[PDB]
C-alpha cells in the first residue's frame, strides 16, 4: 500500500531523518524531508522579511508582535516535554505563569 | 544531529566572518542558553571583531537581493556581472568603448 | 501448576519453568476477565504487575537458553571512555547477521 | 531537551499542516492502557 | 612496564615488541588511570606522542611482516634518466586481489 504511515510520530521522524542518509533506503522519504526543510526555511525567510527588528524591554518580543503565533503559549495537543514550558515560564515573567 | 559523536567535540564553530552566517551552529555547540541563543540569533548579525561593515560594503545589497527574490539565479547572476566593475576614469572609458 | 484459583505458589518458578503457551491458551479460553476473588489477587493491579513480571521473566529465560546459537546483546552507545582527554570512542551500529551462519 | 526552535517547529506542525490534512477526521480519544498492555504483551517462543 | 596509573611506561615498549590488539584491550579493559599525584602526568603531550610513535611502529611492522605477497616496489614518475628513448614496461600499481603474487 504506497499510503506511508507513521505520519503523526514527526518527533522521531526528525531525529530518524539524520540516519536516514544511508542510500539503501528509498529516496521518496528523504526527498519529502530535503522539501519540508525548505518550506521551514522559506517561512522563516518570509516571517522574518516581514517583522522589523526593533523595541522590546524583556527579549525578543519582535517575532511575537508581529507574528502572534511565535508565542510559546499554544502547546501541542499532546504533551511530550515540559523543559520548553519552564523555560518560557521563566522568560516571559509577565504572564503570571 | 549525531548520536554517534558528542555535540562539540570535534569542531568549534564559531562567528568570524560576517558574510558565513551559522545560526545552527551555535545551538548545535551546546553550553549556551535559548534566551541567548535566540537573542543573538536576531539582534546581532555581525561578530564584534568584523563588527565594522564599512570596510567592504559589498556583499549586504546582494545578499539582500538573493534573500528577497528567492529564486532567478540568471539575473541575479547577470546583475552581478555588470555591476563587477571599476571606478578607475580609465576603466569608465574601457567599458564605454 | 497452572490454575489461577491458588497461584501464590506457581508464580515465578513454575511461570519461569513451564513455557507461556498454556498460560496464553488458559488466558484465550478465558476471555479478558478473571476471578480475582480466589487466591492472593488483591484487586486488579497487582495481578497485572504479577503477570507482566512473569511474562518479562520467561522472556528473558527464552532469551538466555536461546543465546547459544546467537550472539550477545550490545548497547546502542558504548559509554566506556574514561580516556576522555585521550581520545573519544564511537558508538556501536550492529548491521550484520544476528546469527553465526 | 533542545532550543526552543524544536518547539515552534513541532507546535506549528501540530497547529498547521495536521489539522489543514486532516480537519475531516481528526478526533482525540483516551485509551485503555489497563486492557490494552496484557493484550499485546502474549510473549509466544516457537521452536527455533 | 603496563601500570595504567602512569600513561609512561606502556607507550613504544610494550607495544611495538608484540601486536597492539592485546596491549589496546588491556588499556581498554583497565579504565584509563588513577592517582595522577604520584607520577609523571605532567605534560601529556608528549606521552601521546611517544604512544602514538610507538603505535605507528608496532603498525609498519606488522605490515612488513604480514606484507608477503607485495614485496617490490617502484616510482610512478617518467623521463628520469637521460635514456628515455625507449618505452619500459607499462603494467598496473597494486590495484588489484592479490593472486599471481
Redesign the interface.
Given at each position: 500500500s504506497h499510503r506511508v504511515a507513521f505520519v503523526?510520530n514527526?518527533?522521531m521522524l526528525?531525529?530518524i531523518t539524520?540516519y536516514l542518509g544511508n542510500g539503501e533506503l528509498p529516496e521518496v522519504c528523504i526527498n519529502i524531508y530535503r522539501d519540508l526543510l525548505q518550506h521551514?526555511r522559506?517561512l522563516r525567510?518570509t516571517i522574518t522579511?516581514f517583522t522589523i527588528?526593533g523595541e522590546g524591554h524583556n527579549?525578543?518580543t519582535?517575532?511575537a508582535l508581529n507574528n502572534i503565533?511565535?508565542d510559546?503559549t499554544?502547546?501541542?495537543?499532546?504533551l511530550?516535554?515540559c523543559?520548553?514550558l519552564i523555560?518560557?515560564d521563566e522568560?516571559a515573567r509577565d504572564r503570571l505563569p | 544531529?549525531?548520536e554517534t559523536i558528542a555535540t562539540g567535540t570535534f569542531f568549534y564553530p564559531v562567528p568570524v566572518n560576517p558574510l558565513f552566517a551559522c545560526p545552527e551552529h551555535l545551538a548545535s555547540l551546546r553550553g549556551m542558553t535559548?534566551?541567548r541563543r535566540?537573542?543573538a540569533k536576531?539582534?546581532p548579525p555581525i561578530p564584534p571583531f568584523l563588527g565594522a561593515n564599512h570596510h567592504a560594503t559589498i556583499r549586504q545589497p546582494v545578499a539582500y537581493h538573493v534573500?528577497?527574490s528567492?529564486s532567478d539565479f540568471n539575473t541575479l547572476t547577470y546583475s552581478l556581472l555588470g555591476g563587477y566593475f571599476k571606478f578607475t576614469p580609465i576603466s569608465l572609458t574601457h567599458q564605454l568603448r | 501448576s497452572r490454575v489461577v484459583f491458588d497461584p501464590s505458589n506457581p508464580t515465578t518458578f513454575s511461570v519461569e519453568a513451564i513455557a507461556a503457551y498454556t498460560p496464553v491458551a488458559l488466558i484465550r479460553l478465558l476471555n479478558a476477565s478473571g476471578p480475582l476473588q480466589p487466591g492472593h489477587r488483591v484487586d486488579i493491579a497487582d495481578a497485572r504487575s504479577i503477570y507482566t513480571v512473569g511474562a518479562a521473566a520467561s522472556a528473558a529465560r527464552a532469551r538466555a537458553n536461546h543465546n547459544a546459537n546467537t550472539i550477545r546483546r550490545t548497547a546502542m552507545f558504548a559509554e566506556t571512555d574514561p580516556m576522555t582527554w585521550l581520545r573519544p570512542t564511537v558508538g556501536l551500529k550492529r548491521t550484520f547477521n544476528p546469527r553465526i551462519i | 531537551?533542545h532550543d526552543?526552535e524544536?518547539?515552534?517547529?513541532?507546535?506549528?506542525?501540530?497547529?498547521i499542516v495536521?489539522p489543514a490534512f486532516s480537519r475531516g477526521s481528526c478526533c482525540?480519544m483516551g485509551v485503555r492502557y489497563d486492557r490494552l498492555y496484557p493484550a499485546l504483551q502474549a510473549v509466544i517462543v516457537p521452536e527455533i
Open positions: 503523526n514527526f518527533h526528525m531525529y539524520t521551514v522559506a525567510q522579511d527588528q527579549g525578543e519582535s517575532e503565533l511565535t510559546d499554544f502547546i501541542a495537543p499532546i511530550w516535554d523543559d520548553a523555560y518560557r522568560a | 544531529y549525531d535559548n534566551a535566540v537573542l536576531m539582534v534573500t528577497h528567492k | - | 531537551h526552543r524544536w518547539g515552534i517547529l513541532s507546535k506549528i506542525y501540530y497547529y495536521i482525540t
